[PDB]
PDB file of C-alpha atoms and ligand atoms in Angstrom:
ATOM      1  CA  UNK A   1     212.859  45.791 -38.998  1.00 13.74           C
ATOM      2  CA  UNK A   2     211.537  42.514 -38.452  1.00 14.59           C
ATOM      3  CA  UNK A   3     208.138  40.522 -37.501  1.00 10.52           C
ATOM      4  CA  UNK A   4     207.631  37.796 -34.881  1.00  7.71           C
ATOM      5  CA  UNK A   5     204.758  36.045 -33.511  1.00  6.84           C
ATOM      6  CA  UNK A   6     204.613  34.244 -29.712  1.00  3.19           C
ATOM      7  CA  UNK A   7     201.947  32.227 -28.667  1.00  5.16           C
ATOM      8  CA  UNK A   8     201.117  29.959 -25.931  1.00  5.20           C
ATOM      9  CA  UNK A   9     198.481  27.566 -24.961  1.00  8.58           C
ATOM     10  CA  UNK A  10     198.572  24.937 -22.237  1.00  9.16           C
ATOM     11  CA  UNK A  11     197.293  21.217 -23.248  1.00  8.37           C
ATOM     12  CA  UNK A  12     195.991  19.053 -21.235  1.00  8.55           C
ATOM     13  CA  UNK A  13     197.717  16.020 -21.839  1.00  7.18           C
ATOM     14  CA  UNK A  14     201.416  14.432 -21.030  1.00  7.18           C
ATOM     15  CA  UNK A  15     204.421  15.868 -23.001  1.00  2.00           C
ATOM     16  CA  UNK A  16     204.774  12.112 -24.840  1.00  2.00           C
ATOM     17  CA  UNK A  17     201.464  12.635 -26.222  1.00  2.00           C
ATOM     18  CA  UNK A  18     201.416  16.550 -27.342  1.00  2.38           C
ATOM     19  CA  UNK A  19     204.798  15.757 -28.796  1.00  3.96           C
ATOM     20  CA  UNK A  20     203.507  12.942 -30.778  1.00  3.18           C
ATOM     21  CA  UNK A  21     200.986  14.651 -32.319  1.00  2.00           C
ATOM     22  CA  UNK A  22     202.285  17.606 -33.354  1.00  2.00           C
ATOM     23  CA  UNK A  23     205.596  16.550 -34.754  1.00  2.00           C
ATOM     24  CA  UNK A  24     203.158  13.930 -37.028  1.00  2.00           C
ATOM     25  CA  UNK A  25     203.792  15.421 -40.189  1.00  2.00           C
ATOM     26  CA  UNK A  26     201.025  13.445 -41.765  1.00  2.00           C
ATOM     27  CA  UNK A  27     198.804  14.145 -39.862  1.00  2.00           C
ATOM     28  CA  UNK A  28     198.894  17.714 -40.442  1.00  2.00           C
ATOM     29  CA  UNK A  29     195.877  18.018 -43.224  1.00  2.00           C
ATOM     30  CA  UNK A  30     193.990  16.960 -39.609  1.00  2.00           C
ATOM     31  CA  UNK A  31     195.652  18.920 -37.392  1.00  2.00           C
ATOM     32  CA  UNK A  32     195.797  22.088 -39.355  1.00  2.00           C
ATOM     33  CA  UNK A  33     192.632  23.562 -40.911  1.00  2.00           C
ATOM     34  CA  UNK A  34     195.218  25.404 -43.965  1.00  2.00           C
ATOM     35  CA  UNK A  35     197.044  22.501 -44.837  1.00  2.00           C
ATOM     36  CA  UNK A  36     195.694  20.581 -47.812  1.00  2.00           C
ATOM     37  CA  UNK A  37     198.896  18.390 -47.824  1.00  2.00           C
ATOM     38  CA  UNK A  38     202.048  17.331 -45.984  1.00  2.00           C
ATOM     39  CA  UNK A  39     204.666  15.238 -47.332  1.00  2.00           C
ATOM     40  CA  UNK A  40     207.893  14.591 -45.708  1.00  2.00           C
ATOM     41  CA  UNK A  41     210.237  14.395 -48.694  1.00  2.00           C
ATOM     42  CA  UNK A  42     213.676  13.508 -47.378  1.00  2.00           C
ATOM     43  CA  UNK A  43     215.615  13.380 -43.991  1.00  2.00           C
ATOM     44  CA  UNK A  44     219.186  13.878 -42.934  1.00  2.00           C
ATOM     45  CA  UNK A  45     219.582  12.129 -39.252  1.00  2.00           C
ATOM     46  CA  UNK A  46     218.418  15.257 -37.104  1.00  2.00           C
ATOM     47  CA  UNK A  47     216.238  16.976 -39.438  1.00  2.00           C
ATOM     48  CA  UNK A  48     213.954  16.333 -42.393  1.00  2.00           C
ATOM     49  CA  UNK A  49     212.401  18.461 -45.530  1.00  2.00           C
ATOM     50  CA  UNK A  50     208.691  18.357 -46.202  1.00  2.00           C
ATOM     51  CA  UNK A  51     206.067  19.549 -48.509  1.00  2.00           C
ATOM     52  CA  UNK A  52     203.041  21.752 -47.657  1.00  2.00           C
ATOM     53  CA  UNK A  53     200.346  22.490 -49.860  1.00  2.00           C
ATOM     54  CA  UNK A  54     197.440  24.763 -48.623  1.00  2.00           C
ATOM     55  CA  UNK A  55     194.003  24.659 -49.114  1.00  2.00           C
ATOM     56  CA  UNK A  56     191.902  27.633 -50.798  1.00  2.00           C
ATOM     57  CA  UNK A  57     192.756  30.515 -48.572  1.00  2.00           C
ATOM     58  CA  UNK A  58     190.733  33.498 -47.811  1.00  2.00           C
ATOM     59  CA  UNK A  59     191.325  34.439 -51.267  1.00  2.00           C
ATOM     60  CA  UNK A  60     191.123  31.520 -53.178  1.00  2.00           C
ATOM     61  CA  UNK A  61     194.497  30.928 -53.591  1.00  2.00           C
ATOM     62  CA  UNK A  62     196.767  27.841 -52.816  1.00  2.00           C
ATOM     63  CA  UNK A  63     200.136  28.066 -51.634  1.00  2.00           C
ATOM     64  CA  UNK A  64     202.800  25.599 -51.919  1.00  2.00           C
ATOM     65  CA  UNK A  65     206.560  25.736 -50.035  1.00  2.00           C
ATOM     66  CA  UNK A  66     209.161  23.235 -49.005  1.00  2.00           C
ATOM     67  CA  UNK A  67     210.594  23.589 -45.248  1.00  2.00           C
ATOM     68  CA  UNK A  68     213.568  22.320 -43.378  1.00  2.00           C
ATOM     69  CA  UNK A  69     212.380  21.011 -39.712  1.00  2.00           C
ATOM     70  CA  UNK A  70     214.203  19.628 -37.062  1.00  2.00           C
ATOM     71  CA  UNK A  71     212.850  18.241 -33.914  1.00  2.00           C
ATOM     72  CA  UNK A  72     214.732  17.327 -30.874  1.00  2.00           C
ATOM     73  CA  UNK A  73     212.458  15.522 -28.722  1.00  2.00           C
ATOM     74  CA  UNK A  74     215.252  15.445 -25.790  1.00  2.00           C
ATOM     75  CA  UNK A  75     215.405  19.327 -25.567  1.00  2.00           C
ATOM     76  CA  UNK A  76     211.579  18.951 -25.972  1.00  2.00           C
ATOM     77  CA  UNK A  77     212.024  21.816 -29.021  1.00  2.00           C
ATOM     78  CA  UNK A  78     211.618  21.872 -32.495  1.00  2.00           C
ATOM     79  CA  UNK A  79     213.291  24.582 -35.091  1.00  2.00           C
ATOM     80  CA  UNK A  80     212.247  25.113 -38.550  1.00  2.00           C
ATOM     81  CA  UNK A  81     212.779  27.342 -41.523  1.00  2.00           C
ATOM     82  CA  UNK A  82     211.247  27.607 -44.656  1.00  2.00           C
ATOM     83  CA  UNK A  83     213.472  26.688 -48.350  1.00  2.00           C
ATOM     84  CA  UNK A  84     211.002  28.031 -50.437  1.00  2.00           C
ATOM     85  CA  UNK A  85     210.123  31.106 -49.221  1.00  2.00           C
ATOM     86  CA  UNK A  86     207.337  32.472 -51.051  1.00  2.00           C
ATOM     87  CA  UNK A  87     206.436  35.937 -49.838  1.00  2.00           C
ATOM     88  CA  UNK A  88     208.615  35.854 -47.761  1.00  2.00           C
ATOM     89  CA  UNK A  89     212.375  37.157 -47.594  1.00  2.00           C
ATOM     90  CA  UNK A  90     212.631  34.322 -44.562  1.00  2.00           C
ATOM     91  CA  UNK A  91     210.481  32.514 -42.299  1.00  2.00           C
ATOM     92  CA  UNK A  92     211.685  30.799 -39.040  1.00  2.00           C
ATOM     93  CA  UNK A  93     209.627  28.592 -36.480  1.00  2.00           C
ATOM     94  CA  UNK A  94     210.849  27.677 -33.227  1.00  2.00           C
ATOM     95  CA  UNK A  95     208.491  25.311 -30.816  1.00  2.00           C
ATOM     96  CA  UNK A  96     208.855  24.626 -27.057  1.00  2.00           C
ATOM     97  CA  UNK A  97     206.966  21.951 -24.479  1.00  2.00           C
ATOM     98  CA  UNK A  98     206.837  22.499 -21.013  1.00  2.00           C
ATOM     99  CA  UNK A  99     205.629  20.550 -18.295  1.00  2.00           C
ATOM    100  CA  UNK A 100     202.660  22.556 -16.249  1.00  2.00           C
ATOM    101  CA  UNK A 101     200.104  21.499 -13.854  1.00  2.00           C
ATOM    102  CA  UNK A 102     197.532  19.445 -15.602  1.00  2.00           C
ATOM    103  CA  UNK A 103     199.585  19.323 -18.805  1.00  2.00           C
ATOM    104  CA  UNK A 104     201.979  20.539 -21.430  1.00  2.00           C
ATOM    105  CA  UNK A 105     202.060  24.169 -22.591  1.00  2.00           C
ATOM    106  CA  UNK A 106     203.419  24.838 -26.265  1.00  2.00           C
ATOM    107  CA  UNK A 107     204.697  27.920 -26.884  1.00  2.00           C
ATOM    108  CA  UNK A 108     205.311  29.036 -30.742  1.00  2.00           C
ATOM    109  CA  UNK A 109     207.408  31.657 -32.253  1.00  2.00           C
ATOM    110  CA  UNK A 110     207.453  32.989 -35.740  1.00  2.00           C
ATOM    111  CA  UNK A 111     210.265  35.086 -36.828  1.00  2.00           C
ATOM    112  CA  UNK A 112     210.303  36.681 -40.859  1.00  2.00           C
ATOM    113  CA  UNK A 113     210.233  39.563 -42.739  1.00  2.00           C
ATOM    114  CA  UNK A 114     208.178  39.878 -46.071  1.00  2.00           C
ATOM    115  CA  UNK A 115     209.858  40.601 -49.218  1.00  2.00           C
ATOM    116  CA  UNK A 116     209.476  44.085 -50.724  1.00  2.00           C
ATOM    117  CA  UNK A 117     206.729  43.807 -52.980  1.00  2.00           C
ATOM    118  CA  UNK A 118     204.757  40.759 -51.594  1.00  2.00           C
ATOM    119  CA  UNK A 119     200.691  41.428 -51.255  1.00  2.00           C
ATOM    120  CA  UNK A 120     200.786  42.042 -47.725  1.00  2.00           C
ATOM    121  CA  UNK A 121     203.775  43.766 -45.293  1.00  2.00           C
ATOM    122  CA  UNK A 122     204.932  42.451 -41.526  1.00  2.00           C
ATOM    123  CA  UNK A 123     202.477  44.326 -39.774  1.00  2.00           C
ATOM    124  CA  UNK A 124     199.646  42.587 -41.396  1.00  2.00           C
ATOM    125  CA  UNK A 125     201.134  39.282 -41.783  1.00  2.00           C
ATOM    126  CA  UNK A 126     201.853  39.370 -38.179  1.00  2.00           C
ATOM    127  CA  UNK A 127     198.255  39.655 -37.009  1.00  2.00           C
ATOM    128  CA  UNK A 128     196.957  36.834 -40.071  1.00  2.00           C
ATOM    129  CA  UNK A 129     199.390  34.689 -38.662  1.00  2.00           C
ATOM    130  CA  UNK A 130     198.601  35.512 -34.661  1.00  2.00           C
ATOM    131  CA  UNK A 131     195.109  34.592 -35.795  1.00  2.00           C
ATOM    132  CA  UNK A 132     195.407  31.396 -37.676  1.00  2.00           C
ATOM    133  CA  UNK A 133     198.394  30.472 -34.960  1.00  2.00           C
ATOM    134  CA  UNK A 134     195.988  30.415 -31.933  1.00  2.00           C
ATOM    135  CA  UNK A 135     193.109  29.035 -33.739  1.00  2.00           C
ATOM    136  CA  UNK A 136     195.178  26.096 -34.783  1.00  2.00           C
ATOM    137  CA  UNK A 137     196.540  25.941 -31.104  1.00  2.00           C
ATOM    138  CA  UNK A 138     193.220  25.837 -30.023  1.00  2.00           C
ATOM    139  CA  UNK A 139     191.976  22.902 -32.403  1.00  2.00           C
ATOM    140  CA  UNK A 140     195.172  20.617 -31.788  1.00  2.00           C
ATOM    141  CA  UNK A 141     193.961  21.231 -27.927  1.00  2.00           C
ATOM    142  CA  UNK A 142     190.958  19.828 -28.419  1.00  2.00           C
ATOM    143  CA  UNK A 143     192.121  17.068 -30.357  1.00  2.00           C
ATOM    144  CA  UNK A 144     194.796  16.267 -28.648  1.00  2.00           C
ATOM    145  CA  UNK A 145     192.650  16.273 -25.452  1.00  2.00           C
ATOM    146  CA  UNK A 146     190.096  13.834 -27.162  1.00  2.00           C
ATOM    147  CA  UNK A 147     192.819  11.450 -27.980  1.00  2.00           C
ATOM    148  CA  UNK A 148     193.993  11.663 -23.957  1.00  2.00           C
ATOM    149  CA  UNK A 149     190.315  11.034 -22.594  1.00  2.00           C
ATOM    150  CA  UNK A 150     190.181   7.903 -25.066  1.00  2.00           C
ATOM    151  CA  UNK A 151     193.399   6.528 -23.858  1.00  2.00           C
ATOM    152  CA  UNK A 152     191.731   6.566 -20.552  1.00  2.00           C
TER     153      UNK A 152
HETATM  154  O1  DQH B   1     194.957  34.843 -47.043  1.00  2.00           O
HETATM  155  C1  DQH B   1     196.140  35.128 -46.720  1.00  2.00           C
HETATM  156  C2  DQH B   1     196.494  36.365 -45.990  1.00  2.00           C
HETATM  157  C3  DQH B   1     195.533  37.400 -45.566  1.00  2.00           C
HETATM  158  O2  DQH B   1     194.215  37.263 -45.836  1.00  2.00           O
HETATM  159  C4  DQH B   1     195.969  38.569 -44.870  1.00  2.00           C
HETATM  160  C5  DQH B   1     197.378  38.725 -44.580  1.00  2.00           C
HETATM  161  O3  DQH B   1     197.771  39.840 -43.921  1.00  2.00           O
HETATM  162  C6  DQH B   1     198.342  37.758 -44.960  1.00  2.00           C
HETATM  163  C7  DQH B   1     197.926  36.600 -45.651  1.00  2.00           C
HETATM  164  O4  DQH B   1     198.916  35.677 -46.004  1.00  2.00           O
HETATM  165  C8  DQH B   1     198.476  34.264 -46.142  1.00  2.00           C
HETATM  166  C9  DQH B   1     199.684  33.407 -46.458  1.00  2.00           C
HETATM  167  C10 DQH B   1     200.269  33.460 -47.774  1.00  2.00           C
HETATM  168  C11 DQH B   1     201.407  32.672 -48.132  1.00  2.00           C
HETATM  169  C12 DQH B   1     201.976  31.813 -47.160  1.00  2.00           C
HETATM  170  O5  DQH B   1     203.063  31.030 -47.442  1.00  2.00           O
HETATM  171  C13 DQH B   1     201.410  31.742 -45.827  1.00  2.00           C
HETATM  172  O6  DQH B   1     201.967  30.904 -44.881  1.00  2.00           O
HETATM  173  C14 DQH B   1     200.275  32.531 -45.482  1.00  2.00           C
HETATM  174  C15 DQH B   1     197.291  34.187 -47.110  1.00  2.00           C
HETATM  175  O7  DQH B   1     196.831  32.853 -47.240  1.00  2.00           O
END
């Protein structure tokens, strides 16, 4: 009825640092290899709305959406939804940080459902995104790692 993605990956690093990073909007063209461009373009106390533009994807094509995020660094969460949808009927992102030996382990979850008609269905759009999810996990690791072994 409905797709979902869940992945993990510990970091190496304090919680003040991971969270930080990640929640620095621009800084995502960095971060992110698909993101050509991130601009946050208003904010309502809590939450915020932002641009993303993509670059060239495996098909040559550049997507652009608007998204509603809202961080809560005291629950040490972050929730997110996407305005424009694009493809798809909905698209929801929820982000955890917990404290673990050694570090801080993010844990992301996807939740949507393509619309009828878009280029590719949940089955497949659940494995493109379970791919591009834990390589990006992977590279804000390592970069948020390299930040930590510069600090000390
Ligand atoms: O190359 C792409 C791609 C793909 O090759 C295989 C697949 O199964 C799904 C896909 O979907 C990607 C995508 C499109 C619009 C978006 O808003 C988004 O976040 C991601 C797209 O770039």
């Amino acid at each position: 009825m409905a797709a979902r993605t869940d992945n993990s990956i510990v970091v190496n690093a304090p919680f003040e640092l991971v969270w930080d990073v990640t929640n620095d909007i621009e800084a995502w063209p960095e971060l992110f290899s698909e993101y050509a461009e991130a601009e946050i373009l208003r904010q309502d106390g809590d939450g915020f709305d932002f641009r993303l533009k993509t670059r060239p994807d495996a098909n040559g094509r550049v997507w652009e959406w608007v998204s509603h995020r809202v961080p809560d660094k005291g629950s040490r969460t972050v929730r997110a939804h996407r305005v424009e949808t694009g493809p798809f009927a909905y698209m929801n992102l929820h982000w955890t940080y917990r404290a673990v030996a050694g570090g801080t382990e993010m844990r992301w979850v996807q939740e949507f459902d393509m619309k009828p008609g878009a280029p590719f269905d949940n089955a497949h759009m659940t494995a493109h995104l379970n791919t591009t999810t834990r390589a990006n996990m992977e590279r804000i690791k390592k970069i948020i790692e390299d930040r930590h072994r510069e600090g000390q």
